[PDB]
Every structure is written in structure tokens, then in C-alpha cells.
């Protein structure tokens, strides 16, 4: 199970659409593909200026994300935390055979020259390699991370990268101090499961490569490097090695990121590239940043979280959705079984645990389907009295990237439009026609 | 203009089917109707027990009502407005020819034996007319009124009926305390502008009648009735005489309603049916409760007032939406273009002001769509800092029917998530595809 | 390492204290041990109607609970939560030897002629068995469950039971649906480890012996009952076996409990007992409510939760403290090492989800030592402004016990005693004494 094997399988189940005529790769390719978003994927096979086929939007919505797992939707979150406390090892391969090692280069590597990477908002300050998972071990310990960054094209065999204070960041410091450079590799073009366990947010430890193979059917199968001491998945379209720089900091950005604001330029740390390995005749993947690809990426993964983490505090949860309209982060839907007045109060308090992201939660009861913007509006609209039922927290920990916050400190708003418990059932009873589940009009026109 | 020529016109822009299979209007009509909710129209054309087929859903989004009214949608609400101030009489026209007079009805009148009036929602007591424009005049001054009230089947000539405290109510309290029975016609199979103009909401004067007639092309044709003082258009489907009985109180209900809850059973007024009048070959209209033609009827005639007492205090108003998650009451929308810092909250008091089923406010910048959930939502989460762009009032007054209030009493809350003015501008820019408008995916595939 | 080492250890510090005076077992063992609450176990000798002594007070501190798992202190709730995780099978031991099986008693079972089972606050509906380990295996899977519960004395064979519902409530309740009593055990003067671990707060499948075990520096000996399908610790000074029974309520309470006020009376569930066995010259532990033990039993096993959950927010977080003020439930304290503005009301909200029992939270600096009431207060006094750094929240979910509760439904408030991040950082420099950890007054 690769990508080449997903892009079949989207293709069988009408998913895939192929593009034949040609299209630049600045701008066009993002605004086609946000066309598709949701809907189904794209694959141009006409890139200008390149032989290079670009692919996007390998899965736009949750019901493919769990297909990707091997899982229906129902219980994808329950797999993903599995995969997270049960990683599964890797099989090292050898490097002949292995189709990421089929075109090796390294001298005059000029990555805009091979690869057709987009350029995709007006305000981005250049091409952005967009969907590379970058691979990198601690120095000391020696164990591996996996985590998704942007990588701006500031030069052939150079980029720019945003690196967010978590585990590559700790990674990086302590090679910083030491006054050597920290090796990476990027893969692009990888299968689903991998993308998302990239994302996995986890204790110190874990190798989201083996996280990944335990969602994939077989382990994962890797292949050392050329000129790095990593390993990276033998099946992957492109490979691209090289170092992050100590002491070196460069304007990176502005880019177009996932709340659909560009984020801020600013000095950051330096990639340069001594080698890039491909197959023959490769597929580049893109993601368009605040598709819903890009969206469901780190949704899920937060998803499976906020479900365990409100799990804690209210045990009779049922669902829990961090909403599009939110990026999948901001605003949280929980759905509960309420057992205990006051429950859903906890709930909130829980969600906003979860996650310094997370600013707004409205919970409903069990029946509601929180993933219809509409039924929850409706629940709030005749559930709620803002005045017992909504509370506001000032001046918590929020998100530097959310533009109406004070310098990432934040507000933050809980909405109760749960029943109230022990009263008559009559009251909030919903109205409903008998036999409407039963009954199909597809069959009476 | 009259609904012959709307269905036609329907029929022209796909926006009809037909149902040839046989239907139960117990349920079934409600069932497939529930499923075309703002797709499309149906026609029944056989009914079970009944030679008279059924339609549904004359209009279900805000288009097709624009589109009555003869006007591109973004002038919709002036036009209603100005059909309100300057209203254009009506033509009475003489009795034969009049094809609402082709088959008159005095005798042995068993309504529900002659019409396939459905029962729709679980709970309700029983059949319901829930499409038929109720007119009246007043006792001492004469001038008539035109509102639609839900209408249970209680018997061959006995129709229990819901009058909430507005003109209606006014004219029946003339008459009751005078010992009289006031005089009604009900006329169902009219044009959607007609129903649009019943729930114009004006000076205690005005007929509707009239509003109606300045919304159509040509001057709505009347006809006066068999049995009572009450003029009806002479191009209905169907219409009912009757008398509100003096002193008689006979339960009426439980019946579901707009908010998808069933209003609960209680004694009300009686009419008693004395004539029943119809076309050959009449088609009878349904309006299935919580629908999107129920909601929009009220909508977009409340619509029309929050929009001008919004421009009271915010001049620079660009739009408003009572959205259907709210059922197009509760929940408000404005869009604003920003002159004076603080605006925001004194439109949210506008809306109050409008009307005190406004329990829910959020007003957004003019570039923001507010028909989309998902513009708002995100506006909401990137824009909004509850701690100084929120605020609740508690202990309103809200709406008897909404079960989270307290016997009417209510909370409310306002949402101001409006770009801060006067700021460097480029922090809430919403990032873009330059071309994306030019380019069209259809095109490429 | 079993009770009898303990004791003696307890007694070599200076922590043990024997009363040689007769006292009465109804009101006096509860006044005398509330005076040491904290100071000292007491070790009453002679105990008016019966030969055997009572103890109480087997670990009041936190210093002893952390000693009881052979560790720091300020490793005690990381060495908790490991052993949670990482669960030790026990011993099975043979019945011949065992201390528990010296004296076995299967007939004519009256347990107040026996035991001198005390009778604590006023308002008791009598005597009860308040320091009883309970074990019971579920009657399908057979894995097995630890709970502590009090035991009203009903009768001469009989015991009123309070099972609020947990673990042992969803085995009751499969036993009862099924017409079937549910066999348990109760243990009594066992190792403090013990204890605690019967209050380690897990997933459904895992036996809190095997915690217990993993606590201990051997594994724990158990071994088979006499009248019941049930392992208890072989060295236990005393052991109860019996059976719940089905379709049986009886009047139980009321009761002093752990906030220090009554919990009401009610129709609850009813021990038969089938056995009483026990060592020569058995020793009778009882906790008293509401004190330090009590306490810190539930405190301990919350307060390794409340770290891992705070942390979940707050990956910087030094320490937590459920206050003996709030009853080692209602009140959390919280020290973090502050790194983003606004992080304090995120640690609240984790303590919040920790549990529905809390109730008022303080996050406090790294450097205020959050055992110490005098230097959080000073912390309250000096670096909060209520207008920012206070929120409440009306109506969430709280505890039936807290009386000013509506119901079980509570308000819960938070309160941000941190200094704020980028501001001088040397106006709330606290003063020093420099040489101050190196000179000391008994010296001198
Ligand atoms: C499309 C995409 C782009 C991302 N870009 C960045 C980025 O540029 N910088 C960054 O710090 N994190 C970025 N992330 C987030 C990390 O990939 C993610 O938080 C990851 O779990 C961090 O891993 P770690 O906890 O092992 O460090 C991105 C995630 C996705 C899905
Ligand atoms: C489908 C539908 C059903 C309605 N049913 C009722 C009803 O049962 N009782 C009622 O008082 N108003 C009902 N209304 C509202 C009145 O028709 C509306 O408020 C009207 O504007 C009142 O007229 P007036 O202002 O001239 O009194 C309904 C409206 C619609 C669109
Ligand atoms: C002194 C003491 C007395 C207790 N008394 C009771 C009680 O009477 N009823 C009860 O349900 N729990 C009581 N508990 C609580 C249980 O021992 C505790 O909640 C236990 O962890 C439940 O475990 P479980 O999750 O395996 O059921 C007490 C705890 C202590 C420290
Ligand atoms: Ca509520
Ligand atoms: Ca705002
Ligand atoms: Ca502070
Ligand atoms: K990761
Ligand atoms: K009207
Ligand atoms: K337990
Ligand atoms: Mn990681
Ligand atoms: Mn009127
Ligand atoms: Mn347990």
C-alpha cells in the first residue's frame, strides 16, 4: 500500500480526475485544485515547463481518510489512538530494487529545474514545497521524528523552513549548540496513513514511521539514504536530502496557511540539499494550504486526541468534531450522552485541555449530528440561554497565527445546548415523520 | 400570474417533479416532501383516497421568491419594503368566469371526504391545512386583513384554529365581545408572491391584499364570496367560508412547528366551514412545517424590516440573514461596511430592536458572504475575542415556542467579528488565487 | 515488607506512639487520634471489652506515603503512576504458614464480640469498619478488583456496605441481575503501598493487587480463601470473607465522612459474612475520617492524575497539590514553569478535567513551594489582581457531598497567581538571606 496503489484506488472509486491540458504551476495549479477541494482529487498530467505530473487532494474528506486506515469512518479516531500506543516497526530493504533509489543526483541539483513545485497564494513569497514529510533522529538518542513542514524555494539546492517549537525543534537545538548541522530527508509523495501519522501527536519516544506501520496492512519499507544517516520509505515518489544549518537564519515567507491568513515573514532556519533520489517517471503531490486535505491532516489527529481527552471528564462522550469553519482546530463540537447535570461544562473544559488551539466548543446530546453545521445552529438556537449556558474565559493561551489574538493570548467561549436533565421529555422533543428512514424517493420519481 | 402559471414556470427551470407512484397523505406526503426540501417542487399526482393531487414546496430558496416577485435576488427586500409603503388596490371582478367559482359547495360540506389534507409530523392531532391565507375585515372600520394560521381538521364543517395575538386577534376581539362570530375566507393554491404578502408585517391599516398586488406584474383579480362580506383572489385552487365561532374554546393541537418542535395542545377558537368553492381539477397546497418553504415565507418578510431598522443605526449596512439553522427568527446575521469604530454592537442592537425573536446576533465585514455558514463560522473563529466581542443580556423578552426560555423570557447575545479599524491591514487579509475567478475547472477535464 | 515492618519502622523515627491506658472504642479512639491527626500513629494497647489493639494513623504525611514506596518524595507520584502502568503479578502462597490463616473462625461469628471496630463521630449510625481492602473478581471475565468501603456493623454476621459506582458496583450489578450474591473478601491491617494502591484510579481490566505489588519491594504474598473463590494478602492481620447479597437493601448511615459532614442515610447493599480469620494477637487497623490517612489515600492516587492531565496542557508543570484545606479533592494548587502568557488558565482547566471534584484552583511560579499554605497565600496576595487573573464558571458538574452544591451541580474558579511573562522580572524578586541553607540553629 503506496501512493501509485491509492491513486488507483481513488481512480476506481471515481475520485480521481485527470487534467490534460496544460497548466502553470504558479497559481493555476491551486485554483483548479481549490475548485476540486472536497470533491476529488486532480492530477495534471501537463505541467509548463516540466514532464512532471503534479497530483492533489489525495483525500479531501473523513470517509477516505478511514479507507486509508483500512477502517470505516465510525471508527477511525479509536485506530489512530491504537496506532499511537501500539507502534509497529519498519523493515529496512535494500537500496537496489528499492524504486525511490531508481534516480540518484547529486551534483548541480536545482529542485525548480526537476520538480514542478507550485506557487499557490498571491502573497506567498515564493515556490513551496508543500506536502514533504521530513524525517530526522536526535542526536544523542539517536530515535526518529516525523513531522510535515513548509519548505520555501530559495535557491537550486536550498530552502527556507518554518520550524514550530516541538520535537524537530528540540532536534534542531540541540545540534544547534553544538555547533553542527542536523540531517534530514524529505519524502514526497507518500501514502495517506503515512501523511497522517506524521501528525500523530505523541510522547518524546515515538517514531511516527512506526506508528504508520501499524495503520498501513504491512510494515513500512525503508531505505538508507545516500548522503545522511536516515532512513525513508523505499516506495516514495521523490526523496530529497540534506542538513538544516546551524546558526544560519533566513527570510522565509510570507505564505498562505491554514486559517486562510498569510502567515508572517520572519528569519528562520536553512535547509541545503545534498542529494534527491526519485523514481522513473515520478508524481509530485502538492497540498493546497486551507484545503480540505491540508485540513483533515491535522483535524483527525487532533480529533482522536480531544475524543480521549473529554473521554477523561465526561466518560459517556459519543462524538467530537473540530469543524472546518474553525480549520479544523478553533472551534470544537462534543456530542454527549449527558448522565450528570452540569456535565457538559466539563466537557468544555476538557476540549480546551486538549489543545491551546482550541477557543471555542459548543457541546449537544447524543442524537444531534454534529458534523451538519445546521443541526448544531439548531441546537444552539433553541438549547441555549446565553445567560446560564455560555461562559468566557479572558486572556488564556490561544495561537500567534490567529490574527485577532494579543501576541497568541487569547479568549476563549464555552456554549452549553445540552437539555437539561430531569425534566419532562416532551419539551425538547424533536418533531419527526414515521417511516421517513424507510421510505426513499429516489424510487417514487 | 397566479400558481397555475408559477408550477409552469417551475416546471421551465427543472424545478419541479412529479409523483406518479401512489401516496399516503398520512406521512408519505411529508416523508418524500422532506427529502426535495430547497431541491425542488413536488407534485403528487396521486393521492390515495382523492382524485385532487397534491404540490409542495412552491419555493424553497431565496432565488425562486426573488424570482416571484419579478427582481434579481440582491434587490429582494427593497422591493418588499416598498410594496409595504405604497400598496395597489385590487380589481374586483364579476363571479362568472372566475375560476375559483367553477364548482360551488353549500351543502354536506365533509372537508376532509373532498380535499387530501395531510397529516405531516408524528405528534400532530391530525390533519392540518397549513397553506391557506386567512381574510378577514374588521367589524367597526371594514378594512381587511390577510394572515396564514395552521388549521386542524376537527371535523366535515369544524376547523380548530391557532390565532397568536396580532390583527387577526384584534378583529376576533371585536366581534367576540360583541357576541358575533367573525366572518373568514381561506383561500389555498395561491401565488408565492400572495403567501409572501400575507406575512408582511405593517401598520394595523393595511391590507395585504394590496401589498400583494404591488409584488405581482398585473393587480390581483378578487371575487366576492357565496356565504360571507370577504373578497378572494379569483384564481385560487381552492376556497373555504367560514365564521370564527363567539365564546367556543375546543382543543386545538399539538401540532410540529417551525422550530421543529410540536407546540403543545390547548382550548382555542373554532371556525365552522358554511361554503367550499373550487376550480375543475384543483391542485391542493401543503406547506410541511419546519420546511424551507415554511421558514423563508416568514424570513425573508422579517428580513425586510431588520434590514431597515438595521440602516437606522448603522447606515452603511450592506446585509442581513435570518439563517435556516435558526429557523430564519432566532438566529441574525448582518454584514456591515465599517465607518466608526464600535458599530458592530450597536447593529447587534438593531437587530434586538427588529423583532424579540432575535436571540442570536453576529455581525461580519461587508466582503464576508453571509448565506454561507462556513464565511461566518470562520469569521467568528479568526475575528471574535469573546472577552470584548461578545455580550449577553440576560432576562428579555424572547418566544413563547423556543423551550430553553423561561415562559418567554430569554437571553441574548451579540458577536462582533469585525476586523478592528484603523490597523495595519494587512493582518486580517484573506489570502487568494490571482485568476481563480478567470480560470473554470470544466474547461480542463 | 508487610504492617508488623512498618510499625516497627515507624516506631524507629519516632512516628509511633503507644497508649497504655484503656480506651473506649466508642468516641475516645477517634478524639485521641484526631489530637496526633498528622504528628504520630497511635497504637491503643488496651482497648475496653476486647484483647486485641487498635492502630491508627499509619501514614498522616506525605513523606511517609513516599517512604511506604521506597522513594523521594519528589519522585512518589511518578513511581505511582508507573506502577499503574506497569502492573507486578503477586505470589500465590500456601495456606499452611500464612500469618492470615492462625486462627480461623467459621461459626458463631459476631463481629463486634471480636474485633474492637469503632465508633467515630457523633452522628454515626454506629460502629464501622473504615481501613478494610476489598477484593472480588468479576463473575464473568474472573479478573479482579480492590476498592476500600465502609462497613456499617448491622448485626453479629452482617455489614451495611456503601458502593458508590465504580468498579465494584458493575460487578455487583452483573452478580444481582443474575439472582447470584457477589463473594469478596475484606483484608485489614495491611501495608500502607496497599492501601494505596486499592485507590489507584485505572482502566477496567487491571487488579490492584498487581499495582500494589509493583509499590512493594517483593512481590505480595496472597493466598486462597477459606468460604469464597478469593486471594487476600497472606500477611494481613485480619481478613472478613463474605458475599453481598441480591435484591437486598438495608438502611445504611448515616456516617462522618471525608469533608467532615455527614453522608445521609440510605436503602444500600448487605454483607453477609461466611468467615473471619486473622493472626495470633491480631492488631485492628482504623482510619478515622476525615484525617490525614483518609485523606491522603484518595489525594496521592488524584494527585498522580492531576499531574499527568495538567501536563497534557502544561507540559512544564513542576508540581500539584490537592490541598488538606479542600480534603484532598476540592482545592488543587498548581506550580508550572510559565513559557507562554496565558498558560495558568489552561493548567486550570486541565486540573478541572483531572476530576469533578475540583472545585478552586491556584497555579503558582516554580520557585513557590505549593505544600506550604503560608507561601501560596503570599503568592495570592502579592501577584494576583482579581479583575484579570480570577475567572468563575456557574453551573458545571461538582460533587453530591460539597453541601453547598445544588444537587451534585457546582460553580468553579480559578485563580492566576503567576507573574506575568515579559514585564522587569526583578519587581517580584522575593528577598533572601544569603548563607541561609548553609547555617543552621542547632549549631549555634
Ligand atoms: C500541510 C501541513 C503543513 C505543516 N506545516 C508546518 C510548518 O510549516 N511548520 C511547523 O512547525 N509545523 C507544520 N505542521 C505541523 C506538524 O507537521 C505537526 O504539528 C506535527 O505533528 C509535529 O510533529 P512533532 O510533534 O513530532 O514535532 C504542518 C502540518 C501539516 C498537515
Ligand atoms: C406556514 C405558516 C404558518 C403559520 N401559522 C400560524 C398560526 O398557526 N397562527 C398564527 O397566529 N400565525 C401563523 N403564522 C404567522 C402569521 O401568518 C403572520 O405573523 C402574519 O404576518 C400575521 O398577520 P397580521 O400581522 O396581519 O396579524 C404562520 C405563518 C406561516 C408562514
Ligand atoms: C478511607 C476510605 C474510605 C472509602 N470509603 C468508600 C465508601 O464507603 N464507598 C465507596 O464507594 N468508596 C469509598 N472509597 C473509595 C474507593 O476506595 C475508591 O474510590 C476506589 O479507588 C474505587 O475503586 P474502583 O475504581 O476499582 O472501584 C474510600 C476510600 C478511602 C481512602
Ligand atoms: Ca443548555
Ligand atoms: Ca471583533
Ligand atoms: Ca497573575
Ligand atoms: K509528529
Ligand atoms: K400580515
Ligand atoms: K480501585
Ligand atoms: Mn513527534
Ligand atoms: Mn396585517
Ligand atoms: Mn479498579
Known sequence: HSLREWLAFLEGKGKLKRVRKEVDPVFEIAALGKQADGICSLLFERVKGYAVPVVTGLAGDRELFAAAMSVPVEGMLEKLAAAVENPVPCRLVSPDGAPVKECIIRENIDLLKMLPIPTHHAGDAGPYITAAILIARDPDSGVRNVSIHRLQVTGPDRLGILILPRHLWHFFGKAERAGRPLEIALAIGVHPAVLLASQATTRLGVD?????????????????????????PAGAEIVIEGKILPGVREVEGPFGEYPRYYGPAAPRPVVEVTAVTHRRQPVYHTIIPASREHLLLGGIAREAVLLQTVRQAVPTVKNVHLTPGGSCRYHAVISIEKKHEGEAKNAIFA??????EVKHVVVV???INIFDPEEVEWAVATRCQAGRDVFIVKDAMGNRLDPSSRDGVSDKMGIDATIPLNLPGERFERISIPGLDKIKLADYL
Do not use: N, Y
Open 208 to 232: 511516527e514511521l512506526e506508528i504508520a506501520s501499524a495503520l498501513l496492512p504491512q510494515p513500512l519499507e525503508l531505505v538508507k539514504c545516500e548522503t545522511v544517516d536516515v532512513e525513508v
Open 351 to 356: 476540549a480546551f485541555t486538549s489543545s491551546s
Open 365 to 367: 446530546d447524543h442524537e
